[PDB]
Amino acid sequence: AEYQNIFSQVQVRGPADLGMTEDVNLANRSGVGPFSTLLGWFGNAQLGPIYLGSLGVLSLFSGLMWFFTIGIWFWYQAGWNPAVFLRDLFFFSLEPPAPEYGLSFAAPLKEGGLWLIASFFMFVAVWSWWGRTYLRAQALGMGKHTAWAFLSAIWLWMVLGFIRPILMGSWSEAVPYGIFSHLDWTNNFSLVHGNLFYNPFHGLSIAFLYGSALLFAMHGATILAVSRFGGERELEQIADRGTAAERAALFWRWTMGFNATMEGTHRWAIWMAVLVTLTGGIGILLSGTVVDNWYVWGQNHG
Amino acid sequence: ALLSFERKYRVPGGTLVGGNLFDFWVGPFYVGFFGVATFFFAALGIILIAWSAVLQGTWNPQLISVYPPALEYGLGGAPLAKGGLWQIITICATGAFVSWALREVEICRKLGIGYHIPFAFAFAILAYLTLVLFRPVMMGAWGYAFPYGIWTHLDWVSNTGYTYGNFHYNPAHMIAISFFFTNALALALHGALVLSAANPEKGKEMRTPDHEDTFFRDLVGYSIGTLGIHRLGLLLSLSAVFFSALCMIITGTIWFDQWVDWWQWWVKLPWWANIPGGING
Amino acid sequence: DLASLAIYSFWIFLAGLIYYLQTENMREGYPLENEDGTPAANQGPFPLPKPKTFILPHGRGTLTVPGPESEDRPIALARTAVSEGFPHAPTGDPMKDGVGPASWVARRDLPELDGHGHNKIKPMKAAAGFHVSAGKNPIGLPVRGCDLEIAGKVVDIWVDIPEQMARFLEVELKDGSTRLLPMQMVKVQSNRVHVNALSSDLFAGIPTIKSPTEVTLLEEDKICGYVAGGLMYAAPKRKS
Ligand code: BCL
Ligand code: BCL
Ligand code: BCL
Ligand SMILES: CC[C@H]1c2cc3[nH]c4c(c3C)C(=O)[C@H](C(=O)OC)c4c3nc(cc4[nH]c(cc(n2)[C@@H]1C)c(C(C)=O)c4C)[C@@H](C)[C@@H]3CCC(=O)OC/C=C(\C)CCC[C@@H](C)CCC[C@@H](C)CCCC(C)C
Numbered sequence: 001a002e003y004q005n006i007f008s009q010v011q012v013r014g015p016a017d018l019g020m021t022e023d024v025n026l027a028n029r030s031g032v033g034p035f036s037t038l039l040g041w042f043g044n045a046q047l048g049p050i051y052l053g054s055l056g057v058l059s060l061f062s063g064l065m066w067f068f069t070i071g072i073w074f075w076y077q078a079g080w081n082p083a084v085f086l087r088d089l090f091f092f093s094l095e096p097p098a099p100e101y102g103l104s105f106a107a108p109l110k111e112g113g114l115w116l117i118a119s120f121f122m123f124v125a126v127w128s129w130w131g132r133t134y135l136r137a138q139a140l141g142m143g144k145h146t147a148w149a150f151l152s153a154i155w156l157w158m159v160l161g162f163i164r165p166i167l168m169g170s171w172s173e174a175v176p177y178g179i180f181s182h183l184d185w186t187n188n189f190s191l192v193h194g195n196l197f198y199n200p201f202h203g204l205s206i207a208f209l210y211g212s213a214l215l216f217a218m219h220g221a222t223i224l225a226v227s228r229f230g231g232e233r234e235l236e237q238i239a240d241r242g243t244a245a246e247r248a249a250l251f252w253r254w255t256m257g258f259n260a261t262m263e264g265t266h267r268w269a270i271w272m273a274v275l276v277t278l279t280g281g282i283g284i285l286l287s288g289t290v291v292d293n294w295y296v297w298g299q300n301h302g
Numbered sequence: 303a304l305l306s307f308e309r310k311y312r313v314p315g316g317t318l319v320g321g322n323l324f325d326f327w328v329g330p331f332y333v334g335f336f337g338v339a340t341f342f343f344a345a346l347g348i349i350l351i352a353w354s355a356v357l358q359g360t361w362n363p364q365l366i367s368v369y370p371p372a373l374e375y376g377l378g379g380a381p382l383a384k385g386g387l388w389q390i391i392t393i394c395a396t397g398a399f400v401s402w403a404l405r406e407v408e409i410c411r412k413l414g415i416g417y418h419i420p421f422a423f424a425f426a427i428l429a430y431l432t433l434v435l436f437r438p439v440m441m442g443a444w445g446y447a448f449p450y451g452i453w454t455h456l457d458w459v460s461n462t463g464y465t466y467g468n469f470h471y472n473p474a475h476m477i478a479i480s481f482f483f484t485n486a487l488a489l490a491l492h493g494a495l496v497l498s499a500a501n502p503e504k505g506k507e508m509r510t511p512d513h514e515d516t517f518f519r520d521l522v523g524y525s526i527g528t529l530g531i532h533r534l535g536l537l538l539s540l541s542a543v544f545f546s547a548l549c550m551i552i553t554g555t556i557w558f559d560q561w562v563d564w565w566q567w568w569v570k571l572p573w574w575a576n577i578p579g580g581i582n583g
Numbered sequence: 584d585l586a587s588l589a590i591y592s593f594w595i596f597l598a599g600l601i602y603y604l605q606t607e608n609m610r611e612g613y614p615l616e617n618e619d620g621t622p623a624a625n626q627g628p629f630p631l632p633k634p635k636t637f638i639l640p641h642g643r644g645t646l647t648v649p650g651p652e653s654e655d656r657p658i659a660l661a662r663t664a665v666s667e668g669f670p671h672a673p674t675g676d677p678m679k680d681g682v683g684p685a686s687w688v689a690r691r692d693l694p695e696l697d698g699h700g701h702n703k704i705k706p707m708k709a710a711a712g713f714h715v716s717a718g719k720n721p722i723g724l725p726v727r728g729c730d731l732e733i734a735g736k737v738v739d740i741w742v743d744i745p746e747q748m749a750r751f752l753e754v755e756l757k758d759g760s761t762r763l764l765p766m767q768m769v770k771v772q773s774n775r776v777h778v779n780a781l782s783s784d785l786f787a788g789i790p791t792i793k794s795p796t797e798v799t800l801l802e803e804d805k806i807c808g809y810v811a812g813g814l815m816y817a818a819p820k821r822k823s
């Protein structure tokens with residue numbers, strides 16, 4: 001076997017990397033976690049340190065709060081029985097209020113209120129994490145791209161659980177918490193709307209979703225392939241193009257007749273990915289608020 | 303015709319077949335021997351689709367559609383218009399894709415870089431071949447294959463999945479879909495990380511991998527790192543397609559009932575089948 | 584209606600976005616050139632972009648792309664045919680000359696530096712706290728080339744300090760001098776390190792570096808260039 005750089009042949013270990021201080025309040029980094037040899041065949045061996053600020057803690061707490069809320073309703077649905085719980089794990093489902101309560105918070109705890117409670121914990125957990133996304137970047141003087149991109153994931157999630165239920169007039173329109181139910185909600189959502197294959201935004205979304213597997217497979221292979229000239233050090237190849245970046249561009253140019261720069265290909269990346277949910281969320285947003293059947297709409301576009 | 307740093311690499315050699323015979327470029331395109339294979343297979347197959355498009359009555363790409371032989375024909379050939387055009391176009395398709403990979407191997411050799419790209423492409427080729435050749439052969443007919451039309455092949459996706467109820471319950475399809483999703487997550491993250499370092503705050507100087515490592519650890523207590531993430535993209539991608547093929551090679555061959563039903567192996571275990579309470583007692 | 588407005592607008596946004604993305608990837612390699620180095624007639628339908636400036640962090644200066652472009656190095660190749668589009672033969676030894684799959688670019692002849700200004704890559708011996716943590720340790724293995732002849736002994740590993748990753752084997756010749764091999768082009772096994780790209784007699788010819796505790800981006804390019812070149816150019820002495 002000639003060698004492929006998929007796993008490492010040697011791990012090498014130094015002092016724990018505490019990382020650049022920049023405008024970061026170091027009060028808040030934890031200290032280093034331990035070192036997984038296992039992780040280290042593949043990527044980095046070192047776990048931690050993590051930073052937890054006040055916003056940090058907030059997010060992570062309501063995080064667990066949502067998880068723990070879903071989880072009692074599951075133990076309850078299991079009637080407190082540990083073996084039943086394990087057995088019926090994918091079957092338990094925490095559902096939203098019935099269509100009757102509309103958008104009200106009135107619904108009893110045991111038929112929708114528990115849902116909104118968990119939904120409330122999820123909403124502050126996600127959004128706080130979001131601002132955590134930006135803040136960690138500010139402290140380091142990095143650009144804002146992670147938060148912008150994370151905003152695209154949030155837009156679908158937003159439209160699914162909140163924007164769309166409001167616009168349609170009730171919380172029953174939104175998605176159960178549970179492994180099978182959310183699958184069922186999905187399949188079901190499509191049926192009620194005329195099959196999402198006829199919704200042009202769905203189709204676009206697939207093109208990007210598949211497209212991201214294409215791009216990353218291309219890109220990840222391209223790098224591993226030029227990794228024998230230090231290709232993986234993309235930022236310094238951006239600052240000072242080396243043979244790795246050249247031989248990369250020219251693979252794609254000789255194959256398909258155009259190519260990227262080491263920096264550009266990352267902008268293909270961020271967009272290919274972000275467009276998946278951007279596009280998706282427009283597609284759901286419009287479902288049933290503006291088009292009740294995609295087939296029908298499709299029949300005479302306008 | 304050339305990129306500014308390009309001449310120095312345009313040297314003779316690396317070919318797989320043909321020696322120096324088809325070793326040249328046309329505009330930016332390298333020409334394999336396999337560049338010549340691909341053009342022949344791809345132009346023949348396009349010609350046969352344009353052909354087929356008249357035998358069928360339309361010139362509109364949203365209508366052109368080429369269907370496999372009907373189930374009745376089993377594994378045999380089938381007249382040109384009753385499915386054989388499809389049989390020949392599929393042979394062109396495979397011919398054209400396998401050439402493309404082999405052409406990519408040749409480009410790899412001239413350039414002194416590794417074989418990762420075509421190896422990766424190969425998983426796509428295998429997925430296609432799973433839909434149009436492996437699965438139909440394990441099942442008895444070319445007619446289980448999908449047809450070549452923009453909108454008619456989604457017809458085939460709906461029809462095929464709905465033969466097992468909600469396809470969501472196909473457990474390999476679940477793992478596949480997880481791989482796809484995680485892949486798009488890694489793609490968003492990698493892109494935005496690298497850009498956020500090369501394009502920092504403003505007036506500010508370019509960040510370093512130490513920054514990229516640092517931001518990640520700050521956010522989630524971990525960073526896989528710059529070699530890591532490219533290995534991961536590759537793995538996530540390829541794993542997605544591998545479980546894509548696996549979920550389809552097994553559907554209709556070793557499992558052919560309603561996928562939702564498979565799950566009963568779990569719920570029906572001795573230790574708890576008959577305990578009462580919860581959703582299944 | 585609204586859903587038709589959104590889709591059609593989206594197609595428009597999508598076209599500008601493709602355009603923007605396409606132009607962005609022109610900040611290198613462009614303008615296109617003829618096989619003789621002068622500007623090609625046709626540059627395709629995309630204009631160059633207004634240029635941008637990266638500020639490099641250790642008073643290392645600027646990059647501003649696109650900008651005027653050259654190889655900053657002689658290219659020992661000549662045309663092998665009378666019109667655009669054929670291979671250009673190496674006029675010399677391709678390996679010694681840095682052409683073809685042995686090519687390197689004229690990157691800066693300083694070392695890439697960590698986030699803290701220190702050289703990123705050091706021999707493990709001058710790197711405090713750094714040791715081999717898992718897998719077979721190469722150090723002290725004999726190094727074998729594609730002719731199955733021994734060409735030296737591994738005497739340290741050069742490591743990436745901030746990513747904690749092996750990046751070269753420093754290997755010693757009959758000579759007593761050393762060369763760097765890219766970690767990615769060697770196979771570390773039980774009783775030896777095998778190197779396929781190079782025959783035993785082509786190790787002396789590996790590009791040498793100026794300090795023995797630093798590599799520069801330029802040296803790194805010439806070394807990686809050279810060994811990758813061997814896959815094509817040492818195929819004469821490669822056995823089975
Ligand atoms: C993969 C599992 C299913 C399947 C499920 C879906 C579903 C579901 C959807 C599509 C959609 C698409 N699929 Mg399909 N599709 C399958 C297999 C294929 C094959 C194949 C050779 O096996 C091809 C060529 C396509 C092609 C297509 C495109 C028409 C469209 C957007 C794809 C995309 O962006 O990919 C990522 C790739 C890129 C961004 C690279 C660009 C790919 C280009 C645009 C493809 C052009 C194909 C061309 C029109 C065929 C022309 C003949 C040539 C002249 C020879 N599908 C199998 C049977 N496909 C979407 C659609 O809108 O349907 C109308 C959609 O919703
Ligand atoms: C029978 C079912 C219907 C169908 C119904 C739907 C429905 C309904 C929807 C989709 C959606 C999608 N479908 Mg469809 N779909 C069908 C058939 C297909 C087929 C196919 C035929 O092969 C394909 C390839 C797809 C593909 C796709 C995707 C492009 C798109 C989802 C994008 C995404 O990334 O979601 C994954 C990403 C997210 C959901 C965002 C998550 C972000 C949040 C912020 C993260 C929260 C994390 C949480 C806190 C947990 C943390 C735990 C941690 C470990 C700590 N569908 C059939 C036709 N499909 C979605 C879409 O937009 O379409 C318009 C959608 O709503
Ligand atoms: C109602 C429909 C069913 C369903 C039934 C099916 C069926 C049936 C299938 C899938 C398949 C898939 N489904 Mg499902 N699926 C459903 C729900 C979903 C949802 C969702 C959110 O609800 C999602 C995200 C998915 C996702 C997926 C993936 C796991 C997989 C598609 C990718 C793939 O296989 O690529 C593999 C990629 C290819 C095959 C492309 C091959 C490219 C080739 C090699 C080269 C082409 C080049 C081109 C010709 C060049 C043109 C010229 C140039 C453009 C210039 N399914 C619903 C429940 N799903 C498919 C699968 O697993 O396939 C194996 C499949 O067959
Ligand atoms: C790891 C798998 C992921 C992946 C990877 C991947 N794809 C790849 C590669 C890699 C590494 C390449 O190197 C190669 C490439 O050159 O990319 C630019 C490629 C490629 N993947 C492509 C398409 C493609 N990949 C897809 C998917 C995926 N590719 C996976 C998700 C899809 C999806 C998701 O649906 C599509 C549509 C092409 C851009 C390119 C392959 C180009 C090629 O092989 O060119 C040769 C052939 C022709 C130019 C003409 C076609 C020949 C005729 C026989 C016509 C008819 C065939 C027929 C089936 C028509 C179908 C009709 C449809 C409407 C359904």
Ligand SMILES: COC(C)(C)C/C=C/C(C)=C/C=C/C(C)=C/C=C/C(C)=C\C=C\C=C(C)\C=C\C=C(/C)CC/C=C(\C)CCC=C(C)C
Binds near residue numbers: 120122177
């Ligand atoms: C082992 O035992 C213990 C005790 C640890 C507990 C175990 C628990 C387990 C295993 C739990 C499993 C949980 C699961 C399976 C969760 C799955 C969730 C899924 C699958 C999908 C979710 C999709 C969610 C969406 C789309 C939600 C969007 C939500 C919003 C937009 C917020 C909505 C707004 C609300 C509720 C209003 C409140 C706020 C204002 C400002 C008015």
Ligand SMILES: [Fe+3]
Binds near residue numbers: 496532
């Ligand atoms: Fe990258």
